[PDB]
Amino acid sequence: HTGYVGLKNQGATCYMNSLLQTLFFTNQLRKAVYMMPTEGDDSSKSVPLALQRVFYELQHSDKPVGTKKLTKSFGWETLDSFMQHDVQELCRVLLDNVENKMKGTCVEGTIPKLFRGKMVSYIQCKEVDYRSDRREDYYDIQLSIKGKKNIFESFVDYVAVEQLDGDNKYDAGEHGLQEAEKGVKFLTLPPVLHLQLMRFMYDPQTDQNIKINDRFEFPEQLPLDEFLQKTDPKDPANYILHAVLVHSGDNHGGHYVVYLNPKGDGKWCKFDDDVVSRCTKEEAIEHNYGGCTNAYMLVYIRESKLSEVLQAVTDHDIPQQLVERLQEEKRIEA
């Protein structure tokens, strides 16, 4: 009654069902995942093949979709495995294996094209003229929310310059200890932007976590051109909200649900494991600010690359050798 099918809750997988729906509706990722040459892989341990089955089943099955063979493929069959990892770690586990499988084939370099961005982090001396530039990549950004009112205020805190004065002077080597300024600047933003909000904190005093249920606002449209170093016209960093991963509860109780507008048209649905239901745009955006139910991860897509990232995926996009192998497997289950 929604056009989309859900995922089974086969124990305690937490954020995994929410993450699989996010990656499955990254249509450029989905079509590229179908392209992987996996005819000769082992179904017991091949997670690229395992991800294809889940994607094919999410596209065709009328019944809730199973993930048992997928969890077994990357070694997280223990029910504690998902509680002992963050949502970004799981995504890196999936993306690393599909990108390594894409090496040497026609869909090589997909993962860097969608999710990779370029970041610089510097240290600039105040007295002497020494600067240590450091260029590195990212596939996801961790934002601080405690004290910060909205996504605007978390991005300014991410780039804010830190003063390395006092007994915290920077070791400039030959220049000796020097007062300095450390900071981070963004060079490029990826077409599909993964943003994890730090809604949880372990203090060492008491041996337990603590959830930030403070109110944190995020927009449907996020212009990030201000935070880009060397902004270019004709391609602003204007992003559109696609997914909002939601955790409700406290330090002990917790449920992981995701809201998504599939086609990018602002028509939202709630994906509660096996129950998919239409929902208002306010329930997916403004009801998840907090102040308890609130969001912990956000997925944005560049408006310029919006059309090709969310391109329609038809049955012809799935290779027939893959198709015949999955429909093979389906016949042996029965």
């Binding site: 509680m83 963050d86 601080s144 809604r199 372990y202 976590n209």
Partner: peptide
């Protein structure tokens, strides 16, 4: 864990 750390989910140790 043994220090002030943040996560996006309820991450526990092993």
């Amino acid at each position: 864990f043994f220090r002030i750390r943040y996560f996006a989910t309820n991450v526990r140790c092993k």
